[PDB]
Amino acid sequence: VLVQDLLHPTAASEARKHKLKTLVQGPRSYFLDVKCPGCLNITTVFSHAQTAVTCESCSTILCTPTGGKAKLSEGTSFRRK
Amino acid sequence: AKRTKKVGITGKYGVRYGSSLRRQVKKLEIQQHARYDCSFCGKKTVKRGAAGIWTCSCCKKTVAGGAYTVSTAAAATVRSTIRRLREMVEA
Amino acid sequence: PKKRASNGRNKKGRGHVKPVRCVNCSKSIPKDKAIKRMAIRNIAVRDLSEASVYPEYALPKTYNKLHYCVSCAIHARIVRVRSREDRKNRAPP
Amino acid sequence: SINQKLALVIKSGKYTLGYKSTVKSLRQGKSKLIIIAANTPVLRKSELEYYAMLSKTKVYYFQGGNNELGTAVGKLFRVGVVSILEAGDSDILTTLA
Amino acid sequence: IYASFNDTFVHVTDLSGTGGMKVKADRDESSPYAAMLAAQDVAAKCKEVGRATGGTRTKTPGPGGQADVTPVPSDSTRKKGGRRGRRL
Amino acid sequence: MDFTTDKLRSMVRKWQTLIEANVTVKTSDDYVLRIFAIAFTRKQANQVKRHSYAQSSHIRAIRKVISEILTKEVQGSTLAQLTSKLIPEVINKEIENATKDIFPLQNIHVRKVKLL
Amino acid sequence: MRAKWRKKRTRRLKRKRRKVRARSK
Amino acid sequence: TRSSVLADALNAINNAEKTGKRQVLIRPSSKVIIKFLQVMQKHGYIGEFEYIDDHRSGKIVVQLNGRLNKCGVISPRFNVKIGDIEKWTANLLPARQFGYVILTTSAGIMDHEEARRKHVSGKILGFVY
Amino acid sequence: GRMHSAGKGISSSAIPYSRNAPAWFKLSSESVIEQIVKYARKGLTPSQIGVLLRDAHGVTQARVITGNKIMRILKSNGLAPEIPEDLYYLIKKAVSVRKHLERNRKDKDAKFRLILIESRIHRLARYYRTVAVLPPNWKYESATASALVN
RNA sequence: GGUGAAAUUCUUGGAUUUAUUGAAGACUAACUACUGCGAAAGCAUUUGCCAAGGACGUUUUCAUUAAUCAAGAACGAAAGUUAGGGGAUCGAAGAUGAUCAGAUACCGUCGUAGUCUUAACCAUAAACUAUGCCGACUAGGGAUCGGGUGGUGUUUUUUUAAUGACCCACUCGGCACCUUACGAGAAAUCAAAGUCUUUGGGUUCUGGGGGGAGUAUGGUCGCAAGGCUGAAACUUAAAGGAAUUG
Ligand SMILES: [Mg+2]
Ligand SMILES: [Mg+2]
Ligand SMILES: [Mg+2]
Ligand SMILES: [Mg+2]
Ligand SMILES: [Mg+2]
Ligand SMILES: [Mg+2]
Ligand SMILES: [Mg+2]
Ligand SMILES: [Mg+2]
Ligand SMILES: [Mg+2]
Ligand SMILES: [Mg+2]
Ligand SMILES: [Mg+2]
Ligand SMILES: [Mg+2]
Ligand SMILES: [Mg+2]
Ligand SMILES: [Mg+2]
Ligand SMILES: [Mg+2]
Ligand SMILES: [Mg+2]
Ligand SMILES: [Mg+2]
Ligand SMILES: [Mg+2]
Ligand SMILES: [Mg+2]
Ligand SMILES: [Mg+2]
Ligand SMILES: [Mg+2]
Ligand SMILES: [Mg+2]
Ligand SMILES: [Mg+2]
Ligand SMILES: [Mg+2]
Ligand SMILES: [Mg+2]
Ligand SMILES: [Mg+2]
Ligand SMILES: [Zn+2]
Ligand SMILES: [Zn+2]
Ligand SMILES: [Zn+2]
């Protein structure tokens, strides 16, 4: 506000702003390894599937398409890495 | 090349009887000469003669119809509402 | 020049609004610009009930929406023409 | 629809269009289904249905004339009857049809 | 009971199923003093054996009414007066 | 049957959306009848939006089910058990049990019936 | 006079002038 | 479309000047932008700028001071014969004392005074005073 | 924006800063380029491949495991379709509004949007023609096109 | 009955009224809003079908494919024109009853065309925001519409969730409003009508005192009504705008 650091802004001010209106653009969308504990090696999904994914061996259903809340049907774990 | 701007088939009458009379004649003329689609065999082979008589080129069927078209508007609206009251007398 | 920025009433970004016709004179007026007053008055009201069955059961009233076209809104009903800066106040009272 | 499910046997399975080929398909048992246009005459219809019962083939009466049935099967001519000969990956023999 | 403007109506009958008469100057046909005056002889015959005009325009009780079955439409049957209404 | 001028015009508040639906339906009883139905929207009583409006996937889905349950008691009876069925009126929220999973929906009544 | 009545007065005028020399068509 | 990309950066600065504010992020930082912000700092109307590297077409932040009345882009990028640089300066520079009208020549983007030093000419870019 | 409207609504995707691999992804290049060609021959647009590989599998974006873009692999495996995928869809649209027009012949609206659709086709084609990816004789027509989708 | 008051008018034909009840065509009340959608015209009962669309979401695809646009084309309220149908309503014309000095009117009455629909025309509205389109920058404010993200927020209680609606915060894109004025303007007023004498982002279109006159003439479109294009001679010192006082 007539002196304001454009180069180093708060990691919270930019947390409020839009995906494209950050300082360097970046997707606020992650990936997840989802475990349905009826199978051993389970899959790595994208945060807004829009493809209700199914896993290697089973007919499982895990996901559902959405506006982006890619709803992880019946309850399972994950990790944003 | 396009032969006449307006008169189409009605040029045979030349200059006689007035634009309006000729224009209206052209309308039903175009109707009563054209090939229509046959309801029974699917080929565009029903032509007129002896107005109100419509016959398929192959499959040889004849349908009573309008004097220049197969179905008149009237006829079709009867068809519709005759179904209507019939569907009303079994259920 | 303009002497209201709304310059009708209450229509921005619609192009056309079906018209209503005025209670007083039947003149046609765009619904968005008809001054609307809902008249609810009820049906001398204890003479009603003493000499009568159902000892004050219900007591119902008129319910009715009214549309006047400026001209006749101005003649009697609530227009009461305002001043230049007094008119931007859209407080009902 | 089912035009959908039929349109998959053209690109996938084996078929035959036309009245005459369709009945050597119903004589050799090769047909598990035949689809019959709306307007195709009833004498022909009840004949096919006889050949169907003898092959124990199922039939489906396509709402829509043989003009429609032909542009359904992707052909540009009227088709009074179709006979599938392989249902390549369509479930048509396993849908409610 | 049914109240116009320049008349009011009142009439007994079986559930199954009085105007500008007691007054005559014909502007007074609505007037309450005559709604009453002819309501009187109405309750008379009531015991002698034992609605606005609405429809289209003004949807509202009349003067001689107090001294609901109002017909209201689904917004049709365009009103008299044109689009410029009665002009005075 | 009918509602009455008082009650119906008492119910249409501005700042909410009206909903009507009808169906013509049988009885045991060889009768075929057009019902009516009427419902509005409640402001959920923690709510600040002055105008309390649904957004019309709702109004379509609601008569969708109103008529599902409206022709699911009439032809579920004689006319006699029908008159017996709407007088306790709890069909009025035999709609609501459906609709509680979609919208607040105050003031649900059936409001007419009309026959041949 | 009103604008749109001057329009009418002129439309009339020219229909009349249009007529007058189709006499000499 | 953005057409004279230089302008949309240049004008933001001018807006960003009697804003009062003394930083501005500019979009999208072409090679011709940097070599224009550069010539201004060479004469002191802005301070330091920083080429942010999005993997996109770029971003600059220039921290600016209040010495500058009007920087400006002049174009369709008119062509100036060495004999009529002084007709521009006259038209669009307050006095013959100060202010430069930057421009593009074969010898590189350079202010009008350095051009009279180098005896080279080209098309006109803009101006700073 | 919105070349055939006045709706200025931006929504891009934010392509991340990291142009290298995501550094948590196990399979590399060969392992999954081999995967996209199994779906090309399946019959999928390079976008259906890009999405199905984005979510069901680890492939965050083609460009950076591969390094040819997706259409650029099908082109090398010979699986590049007759005409670019976007224009294909634009036609499939134009035909799909037309058959609706020619049966609802009294729809002024769809006729307007056929116009819009078709003149979008003509400008994209005009681009594809001048970049050699369409023959110079290439153009589009109501009756040539109804069999160009299928 | 009708109005300010009257009258033309309808009533042994039981009128106005009530009751049961049927026909026809038109329209979608109330809910309806500083709310939505469409390029604009414009769009408000239900359901099914038919294609279509913006915003959002997107670590998907293409990779400059775009902006604006003489010619040219799609649509285009109302009325109006041609061929059917329709013709309940209201209703240019016309005729009337009144008012007036007069009263072709305003008000009342009758009612033709029209009003509606199909097929074809016509292409104009104060078709208005009297305000070109794309891009950017410059300022505060709480509402609201659509999408979205965030939660040991409240409610449904079923037995708590799942849900649904509601609350709160932010962010995109909408319809608007509010306060300011840096700024602009001849002013009224304007987040653009600003970032202009410190005059240059791209591009289209129109205007050059007032009358004459959108007249004449030619060309062209139309069945017509008319649409587009569109002068001059002459005449004149004003005409006009916004604001101030009377
Ligand atoms: Mg004025
Ligand atoms: Mg308006
Ligand atoms: Mg308008
Ligand atoms: Mg009348
Ligand atoms: Mg007056
Ligand atoms: Mg002569
Ligand atoms: Mg020389
Ligand atoms: Mg454009
Ligand atoms: Mg943008
Ligand atoms: Mg998007
Ligand atoms: Mg309604
Ligand atoms: Mg030419
Ligand atoms: Mg009539
Ligand atoms: Mg007259
Ligand atoms: Mg007279
Ligand atoms: Mg007269
Ligand atoms: Mg007078
Ligand atoms: Mg005009
Ligand atoms: Mg306007
Ligand atoms: Mg504005
Ligand atoms: Mg003007
Ligand atoms: Mg703001
Ligand atoms: Mg916003
Ligand atoms: Mg000021
Ligand atoms: Mg000022
Ligand atoms: Mg001619
Ligand atoms: Zn699975
Ligand atoms: Zn035949
Ligand atoms: Zn009025």
mmCIF file with all atom_site columns, N, CA and C (backbone and C1' of nucleotides) in Angstrom, chain F residues 15-19 39-43 47 49 51-62 102-105, chain J residues 31-33 35 145-147 164-166:
data_model
loop_
_atom_site.group_PDB
_atom_site.id
_atom_site.type_symbol
_atom_site.label_atom_id
_atom_site.label_alt_id
_atom_site.label_comp_id
_atom_site.label_asym_id
_atom_site.label_entity_id
_atom_site.label_seq_id
_atom_site.pdbx_PDB_ins_code
_atom_site.Cartn_x
_atom_site.Cartn_y
_atom_site.Cartn_z
_atom_site.occupancy
_atom_site.B_iso_or_equiv
_atom_site.pdbx_formal_charge
_atom_site.auth_seq_id
_atom_site.auth_comp_id
_atom_site.auth_asym_id
_atom_site.auth_atom_id
_atom_site.pdbx_PDB_model_num
ATOM 1   N N     . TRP F 1 15  ? -40.226 -12.937 -1.235  1.00 0.00 ? 15  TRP F N     1
ATOM 2   C CA    . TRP F 1 15  ? -38.979 -13.473 -0.672  1.00 0.00 ? 15  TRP F CA    1
ATOM 3   C C     . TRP F 1 15  ? -39.048 -14.989 -0.451  1.00 0.00 ? 15  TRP F C     1
ATOM 4   N N     . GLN F 1 16  ? -39.716 -15.710 -1.353  1.00 0.00 ? 16  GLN F N     1
ATOM 5   C CA    . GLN F 1 16  ? -39.584 -17.165 -1.455  1.00 0.00 ? 16  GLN F CA    1
ATOM 6   C C     . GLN F 1 16  ? -40.268 -17.623 -2.737  1.00 0.00 ? 16  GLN F C     1
ATOM 7   N N     . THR F 1 17  ? -40.037 -18.886 -3.092  1.00 0.00 ? 17  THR F N     1
ATOM 8   C CA    . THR F 1 17  ? -40.473 -19.446 -4.367  1.00 0.00 ? 17  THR F CA    1
ATOM 9   C C     . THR F 1 17  ? -41.617 -20.436 -4.162  1.00 0.00 ? 17  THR F C     1
ATOM 10  N N     . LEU F 1 18  ? -42.715 -20.204 -4.874  1.00 0.00 ? 18  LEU F N     1
ATOM 11  C CA    . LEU F 1 18  ? -43.869 -21.090 -4.863  1.00 0.00 ? 18  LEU F CA    1
ATOM 12  C C     . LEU F 1 18  ? -43.576 -22.348 -5.678  1.00 0.00 ? 18  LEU F C     1
ATOM 13  N N     . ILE F 1 19  ? -44.279 -23.433 -5.353  1.00 0.00 ? 19  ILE F N     1
ATOM 14  C CA    . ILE F 1 19  ? -44.164 -24.697 -6.080  1.00 0.00 ? 19  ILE F CA    1
ATOM 15  C C     . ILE F 1 19  ? -45.545 -25.328 -6.173  1.00 0.00 ? 19  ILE F C     1
ATOM 16  N N     . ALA F 1 39  ? -46.351 -25.898 -2.092  1.00 0.00 ? 39  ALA F N     1
ATOM 17  C CA    . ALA F 1 39  ? -45.268 -25.833 -1.124  1.00 0.00 ? 39  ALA F CA    1
ATOM 18  C C     . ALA F 1 39  ? -44.414 -24.607 -1.414  1.00 0.00 ? 39  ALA F C     1
ATOM 19  N N     . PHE F 1 40  ? -43.700 -24.157 -0.384  1.00 0.00 ? 40  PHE F N     1
ATOM 20  C CA    . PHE F 1 40  ? -42.880 -22.950 -0.435  1.00 0.00 ? 40  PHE F CA    1
ATOM 21  C C     . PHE F 1 40  ? -41.555 -23.287 0.236   1.00 0.00 ? 40  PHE F C     1
ATOM 22  N N     . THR F 1 41  ? -40.717 -22.282 0.475   1.00 0.00 ? 41  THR F N     1
ATOM 23  C CA    . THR F 1 41  ? -39.412 -22.520 1.075   1.00 0.00 ? 41  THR F CA    1
ATOM 24  C C     . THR F 1 41  ? -39.322 -21.868 2.447   1.00 0.00 ? 41  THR F C     1
ATOM 25  N N     . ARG F 1 42  ? -38.769 -22.612 3.400   1.00 0.00 ? 42  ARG F N     1
ATOM 26  C CA    . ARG F 1 42  ? -38.428 -22.086 4.712   1.00 0.00 ? 42  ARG F CA    1
ATOM 27  C C     . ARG F 1 42  ? -37.006 -21.542 4.703   1.00 0.00 ? 42  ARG F C     1
ATOM 28  N N     . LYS F 1 43  ? -36.812 -20.374 5.308   1.00 0.00 ? 43  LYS F N     1
ATOM 29  C CA    . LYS F 1 43  ? -35.472 -19.999 5.737   1.00 0.00 ? 43  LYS F CA    1
ATOM 30  C C     . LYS F 1 43  ? -35.055 -20.924 6.873   1.00 0.00 ? 43  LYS F C     1
ATOM 31  N N     . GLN F 1 47  ? -30.313 -18.577 9.448   1.00 0.00 ? 47  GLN F N     1
ATOM 32  C CA    . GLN F 1 47  ? -29.931 -18.154 8.108   1.00 0.00 ? 47  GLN F CA    1
ATOM 33  C C     . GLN F 1 47  ? -30.171 -16.664 7.903   1.00 0.00 ? 47  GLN F C     1
ATOM 34  N N     . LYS F 1 49  ? -29.687 -15.032 4.545   1.00 0.00 ? 49  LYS F N     1
ATOM 35  C CA    . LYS F 1 49  ? -30.263 -14.726 3.241   1.00 0.00 ? 49  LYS F CA    1
ATOM 36  C C     . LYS F 1 49  ? -31.735 -14.366 3.390   1.00 0.00 ? 49  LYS F C     1
ATOM 37  N N     . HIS F 1 51  ? -34.006 -14.018 1.251   1.00 0.00 ? 51  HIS F N     1
ATOM 38  C CA    . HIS F 1 51  ? -34.935 -14.372 0.184   1.00 0.00 ? 51  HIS F CA    1
ATOM 39  C C     . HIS F 1 51  ? -35.199 -15.864 0.005   1.00 0.00 ? 51  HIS F C     1
ATOM 40  N N     . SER F 1 52  ? -34.379 -16.752 0.573   1.00 0.00 ? 52  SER F N     1
ATOM 41  C CA    . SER F 1 52  ? -34.787 -18.138 0.838   1.00 0.00 ? 52  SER F CA    1
ATOM 42  C C     . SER F 1 52  ? -35.257 -18.865 -0.430  1.00 0.00 ? 52  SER F C     1
ATOM 43  N N     . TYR F 1 53  ? -34.349 -19.013 -1.393  1.00 0.00 ? 53  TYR F N     1
ATOM 44  C CA    . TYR F 1 53  ? -34.695 -19.538 -2.709  1.00 0.00 ? 53  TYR F CA    1
ATOM 45  C C     . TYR F 1 53  ? -33.953 -20.836 -2.997  1.00 0.00 ? 53  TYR F C     1
ATOM 46  N N     . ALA F 1 54  ? -34.663 -21.785 -3.604  1.00 0.00 ? 54  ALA F N     1
ATOM 47  C CA    . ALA F 1 54  ? -34.032 -22.963 -4.176  1.00 0.00 ? 54  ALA F CA    1
ATOM 48  C C     . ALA F 1 54  ? -33.542 -22.631 -5.585  1.00 0.00 ? 54  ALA F C     1
ATOM 49  N N     . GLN F 1 55  ? -32.946 -23.612 -6.269  1.00 0.00 ? 55  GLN F N     1
ATOM 50  C CA    . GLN F 1 55  ? -32.289 -23.301 -7.536  1.00 0.00 ? 55  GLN F CA    1
ATOM 51  C C     . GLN F 1 55  ? -32.583 -24.337 -8.616  1.00 0.00 ? 55  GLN F C     1
ATOM 52  N N     . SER F 1 56  ? -33.765 -24.931 -8.581  1.00 0.00 ? 56  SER F N     1
ATOM 53  C CA    . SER F 1 56  ? -34.540 -25.367 -9.738  1.00 0.00 ? 56  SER F CA    1
ATOM 54  C C     . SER F 1 56  ? -34.010 -26.613 -10.430 1.00 0.00 ? 56  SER F C     1
ATOM 55  N N     . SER F 1 57  ? -32.873 -27.162 -10.009 1.00 0.00 ? 57  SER F N     1
ATOM 56  C CA    . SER F 1 57  ? -32.789 -28.613 -9.962  1.00 0.00 ? 57  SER F CA    1
ATOM 57  C C     . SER F 1 57  ? -33.726 -29.122 -8.887  1.00 0.00 ? 57  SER F C     1
ATOM 58  N N     . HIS F 1 58  ? -33.955 -28.289 -7.873  1.00 0.00 ? 58  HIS F N     1
ATOM 59  C CA    . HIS F 1 58  ? -34.816 -28.643 -6.754  1.00 0.00 ? 58  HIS F CA    1
ATOM 60  C C     . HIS F 1 58  ? -36.283 -28.686 -7.175  1.00 0.00 ? 58  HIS F C     1
ATOM 61  N N     . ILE F 1 59  ? -36.829 -27.570 -7.680  1.00 0.00 ? 59  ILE F N     1
ATOM 62  C CA    . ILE F 1 59  ? -38.254 -27.562 -8.028  1.00 0.00 ? 59  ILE F CA    1
ATOM 63  C C     . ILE F 1 59  ? -38.573 -28.658 -9.035  1.00 0.00 ? 59  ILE F C     1
ATOM 64  N N     . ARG F 1 60  ? -37.622 -29.016 -9.906  1.00 0.00 ? 60  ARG F N     1
ATOM 65  C CA    . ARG F 1 60  ? -37.889 -30.114 -10.830 1.00 0.00 ? 60  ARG F CA    1
ATOM 66  C C     . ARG F 1 60  ? -37.838 -31.457 -10.117 1.00 0.00 ? 60  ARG F C     1
ATOM 67  N N     . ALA F 1 61  ? -36.860 -31.643 -9.228  1.00 0.00 ? 61  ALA F N     1
ATOM 68  C CA    . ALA F 1 61  ? -36.734 -32.898 -8.494  1.00 0.00 ? 61  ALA F CA    1
ATOM 69  C C     . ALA F 1 61  ? -37.827 -33.073 -7.450  1.00 0.00 ? 61  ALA F C     1
ATOM 70  N N     . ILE F 1 62  ? -38.492 -31.990 -7.057  1.00 0.00 ? 62  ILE F N     1
ATOM 71  C CA    . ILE F 1 62  ? -39.438 -32.060 -5.953  1.00 0.00 ? 62  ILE F CA    1
ATOM 72  C C     . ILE F 1 62  ? -40.799 -32.562 -6.433  1.00 0.00 ? 62  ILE F C     1
ATOM 73  N N     . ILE F 1 102 ? -33.733 -32.686 0.526   1.00 0.00 ? 102 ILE F N     1
ATOM 74  C CA    . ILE F 1 102 ? -33.459 -31.727 -0.537  1.00 0.00 ? 102 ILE F CA    1
ATOM 75  C C     . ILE F 1 102 ? -33.653 -30.282 -0.074  1.00 0.00 ? 102 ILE F C     1
ATOM 76  N N     . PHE F 1 103 ? -34.810 -29.956 0.499   1.00 0.00 ? 103 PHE F N     1
ATOM 77  C CA    . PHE F 1 103 ? -34.989 -28.537 0.799   1.00 0.00 ? 103 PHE F CA    1
ATOM 78  C C     . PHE F 1 103 ? -35.898 -28.304 2.000   1.00 0.00 ? 103 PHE F C     1
ATOM 79  N N     . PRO F 1 104 ? -35.621 -27.232 2.802   1.00 0.00 ? 104 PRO F N     1
ATOM 80  C CA    . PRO F 1 104 ? -36.469 -26.849 3.955   1.00 0.00 ? 104 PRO F CA    1
ATOM 81  C C     . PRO F 1 104 ? -37.993 -26.890 3.808   1.00 0.00 ? 104 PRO F C     1
ATOM 82  N N     . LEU F 1 105 ? -38.563 -26.216 2.801   1.00 0.00 ? 105 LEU F N     1
ATOM 83  C CA    . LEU F 1 105 ? -39.930 -26.492 2.332   1.00 0.00 ? 105 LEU F CA    1
ATOM 84  C C     . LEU F 1 105 ? -41.021 -26.363 3.402   1.00 0.00 ? 105 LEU F C     1
ATOM 85  P P     . C   J 2 31  ? -46.173 -11.502 -5.922  1.00 0.00 ? 31  C   J P     1
ATOM 86  O "O5'" . C   J 2 31  ? -45.237 -12.752 -5.619  1.00 0.00 ? 31  C   J "O5'" 1
ATOM 87  C "C5'" . C   J 2 31  ? -45.416 -13.550 -4.460  1.00 0.00 ? 31  C   J "C5'" 1
ATOM 88  C "C4'" . C   J 2 31  ? -44.698 -14.864 -4.617  1.00 0.00 ? 31  C   J "C4'" 1
ATOM 89  C "C3'" . C   J 2 31  ? -43.360 -14.781 -5.335  1.00 0.00 ? 31  C   J "C3'" 1
ATOM 90  O "O3'" . C   J 2 31  ? -42.299 -14.411 -4.473  1.00 0.00 ? 31  C   J "O3'" 1
ATOM 91  C "C1'" . C   J 2 31  ? -44.661 -16.503 -6.299  1.00 0.00 ? 31  C   J "C1'" 1
ATOM 92  P P     . U   J 2 32  ? -40.922 -13.838 -5.067  1.00 0.00 ? 32  U   J P     1
ATOM 93  O "O5'" . U   J 2 32  ? -41.350 -12.575 -5.936  1.00 0.00 ? 32  U   J "O5'" 1
ATOM 94  C "C5'" . U   J 2 32  ? -40.405 -11.551 -6.225  1.00 0.00 ? 32  U   J "C5'" 1
ATOM 95  C "C4'" . U   J 2 32  ? -40.705 -10.844 -7.524  1.00 0.00 ? 32  U   J "C4'" 1
ATOM 96  C "C3'" . U   J 2 32  ? -42.115 -10.267 -7.663  1.00 0.00 ? 32  U   J "C3'" 1
ATOM 97  O "O3'" . U   J 2 32  ? -42.039 -9.056  -8.413  1.00 0.00 ? 32  U   J "O3'" 1
ATOM 98  C "C1'" . U   J 2 32  ? -41.690 -11.725 -9.450  1.00 0.00 ? 32  U   J "C1'" 1
ATOM 99  P P     . A   J 2 33  ? -42.067 -7.631  -7.676  1.00 0.00 ? 33  A   J P     1
ATOM 100 O "O5'" . A   J 2 33  ? -40.718 -7.594  -6.833  1.00 0.00 ? 33  A   J "O5'" 1
ATOM 101 C "C5'" . A   J 2 33  ? -39.511 -7.096  -7.401  1.00 0.00 ? 33  A   J "C5'" 1
ATOM 102 C "C4'" . A   J 2 33  ? -38.322 -7.433  -6.537  1.00 0.00 ? 33  A   J "C4'" 1
ATOM 103 C "C3'" . A   J 2 33  ? -36.980 -6.876  -7.012  1.00 0.00 ? 33  A   J "C3'" 1
ATOM 104 O "O3'" . A   J 2 33  ? -36.169 -6.562  -5.880  1.00 0.00 ? 33  A   J "O3'" 1
ATOM 105 C "C1'" . A   J 2 33  ? -36.867 -9.233  -6.909  1.00 0.00 ? 33  A   J "C1'" 1
ATOM 106 P P     . U   J 2 35  ? -30.705 -7.495  -6.482  1.00 0.00 ? 35  U   J P     1
ATOM 107 O "O5'" . U   J 2 35  ? -31.011 -8.959  -7.039  1.00 0.00 ? 35  U   J "O5'" 1
ATOM 108 C "C5'" . U   J 2 35  ? -30.622 -9.336  -8.353  1.00 0.00 ? 35  U   J "C5'" 1
ATOM 109 C "C4'" . U   J 2 35  ? -30.926 -10.785 -8.645  1.00 0.00 ? 35  U   J "C4'" 1
ATOM 110 C "C3'" . U   J 2 35  ? -30.687 -11.226 -10.083 1.00 0.00 ? 35  U   J "C3'" 1
ATOM 111 O "O3'" . U   J 2 35  ? -29.333 -11.562 -10.332 1.00 0.00 ? 35  U   J "O3'" 1
ATOM 112 C "C1'" . U   J 2 35  ? -32.833 -11.931 -9.401  1.00 0.00 ? 35  U   J "C1'" 1
ATOM 113 P P     . C   J 2 145 ? -27.834 -15.347 -3.666  1.00 0.00 ? 145 C   J P     1
ATOM 114 O "O5'" . C   J 2 145 ? -27.639 -15.566 -5.230  1.00 0.00 ? 145 C   J "O5'" 1
ATOM 115 C "C5'" . C   J 2 145 ? -28.699 -15.315 -6.141  1.00 0.00 ? 145 C   J "C5'" 1
ATOM 116 C "C4'" . C   J 2 145 ? -28.254 -15.545 -7.562  1.00 0.00 ? 145 C   J "C4'" 1
ATOM 117 C "C3'" . C   J 2 145 ? -27.345 -16.744 -7.775  1.00 0.00 ? 145 C   J "C3'" 1
ATOM 118 O "O3'" . C   J 2 145 ? -28.042 -17.975 -7.851  1.00 0.00 ? 145 C   J "O3'" 1
ATOM 119 C "C1'" . C   J 2 145 ? -26.413 -14.870 -8.852  1.00 0.00 ? 145 C   J "C1'" 1
ATOM 120 P P     . G   J 2 146 ? -27.317 -19.327 -7.375  1.00 0.00 ? 146 G   J P     1
ATOM 121 O "O5'" . G   J 2 146 ? -26.216 -19.582 -8.496  1.00 0.00 ? 146 G   J "O5'" 1
ATOM 122 C "C5'" . G   J 2 146 ? -26.559 -20.148 -9.750  1.00 0.00 ? 146 G   J "C5'" 1
ATOM 123 C "C4'" . G   J 2 146 ? -25.320 -20.474 -10.539 1.00 0.00 ? 146 G   J "C4'" 1
ATOM 124 C "C3'" . G   J 2 146 ? -24.257 -21.257 -9.785  1.00 0.00 ? 146 G   J "C3'" 1
ATOM 125 O "O3'" . G   J 2 146 ? -24.513 -22.651 -9.728  1.00 0.00 ? 146 G   J "O3'" 1
ATOM 126 C "C1'" . G   J 2 146 ? -23.247 -19.414 -10.839 1.00 0.00 ? 146 G   J "C1'" 1
ATOM 127 P P     . G   J 2 147 ? -23.984 -23.512 -8.478  1.00 0.00 ? 147 G   J P     1
ATOM 128 O "O5'" . G   J 2 147 ? -22.443 -23.742 -8.803  1.00 0.00 ? 147 G   J "O5'" 1
ATOM 129 C "C5'" . G   J 2 147 ? -22.037 -24.162 -10.096 1.00 0.00 ? 147 G   J "C5'" 1
ATOM 130 C "C4'" . G   J 2 147 ? -20.556 -23.983 -10.306 1.00 0.00 ? 147 G   J "C4'" 1
ATOM 131 C "C3'" . G   J 2 147 ? -19.657 -24.486 -9.196  1.00 0.00 ? 147 G   J "C3'" 1
ATOM 132 O "O3'" . G   J 2 147 ? -19.531 -25.894 -9.172  1.00 0.00 ? 147 G   J "O3'" 1
ATOM 133 C "C1'" . G   J 2 147 ? -18.865 -22.402 -9.984  1.00 0.00 ? 147 G   J "C1'" 1
ATOM 134 P P     . G   J 2 164 ? -25.166 -33.174 -0.501  1.00 0.00 ? 164 G   J P     1
ATOM 135 O "O5'" . G   J 2 164 ? -26.443 -32.240 -0.648  1.00 0.00 ? 164 G   J "O5'" 1
ATOM 136 C "C5'" . G   J 2 164 ? -27.694 -32.802 -1.007  1.00 0.00 ? 164 G   J "C5'" 1
ATOM 137 C "C4'" . G   J 2 164 ? -28.807 -32.295 -0.125  1.00 0.00 ? 164 G   J "C4'" 1
ATOM 138 C "C3'" . G   J 2 164 ? -28.757 -30.826 0.246   1.00 0.00 ? 164 G   J "C3'" 1
ATOM 139 O "O3'" . G   J 2 164 ? -29.178 -29.976 -0.807  1.00 0.00 ? 164 G   J "O3'" 1
ATOM 140 C "C1'" . G   J 2 164 ? -29.340 -32.116 2.146   1.00 0.00 ? 164 G   J "C1'" 1
ATOM 141 P P     . A   J 2 165 ? -28.326 -28.663 -1.173  1.00 0.00 ? 165 A   J P     1
ATOM 142 O "O5'" . A   J 2 165 ? -28.844 -27.569 -0.138  1.00 0.00 ? 165 A   J "O5'" 1
ATOM 143 C "C5'" . A   J 2 165 ? -30.162 -27.049 -0.234  1.00 0.00 ? 165 A   J "C5'" 1
ATOM 144 C "C4'" . A   J 2 165 ? -30.656 -26.550 1.099   1.00 0.00 ? 165 A   J "C4'" 1
ATOM 145 C "C3'" . A   J 2 165 ? -29.861 -25.415 1.726   1.00 0.00 ? 165 A   J "C3'" 1
ATOM 146 O "O3'" . A   J 2 165 ? -30.215 -24.144 1.206   1.00 0.00 ? 165 A   J "O3'" 1
ATOM 147 C "C1'" . A   J 2 165 ? -30.255 -27.089 3.345   1.00 0.00 ? 165 A   J "C1'" 1
ATOM 148 P P     . C   J 2 166 ? -29.140 -22.948 1.173   1.00 0.00 ? 166 C   J P     1
ATOM 149 O "O5'" . C   J 2 166 ? -28.772 -22.706 2.705   1.00 0.00 ? 166 C   J "O5'" 1
ATOM 150 C "C5'" . C   J 2 166 ? -29.706 -22.095 3.582   1.00 0.00 ? 166 C   J "C5'" 1
ATOM 151 C "C4'" . C   J 2 166 ? -29.203 -22.037 5.004   1.00 0.00 ? 166 C   J "C4'" 1
ATOM 152 C "C3'" . C   J 2 166 ? -27.897 -21.299 5.242   1.00 0.00 ? 166 C   J "C3'" 1
ATOM 153 O "O3'" . C   J 2 166 ? -28.045 -19.891 5.243   1.00 0.00 ? 166 C   J "O3'" 1
ATOM 154 C "C1'" . C   J 2 166 ? -27.901 -23.313 6.475   1.00 0.00 ? 166 C   J "C1'" 1
#
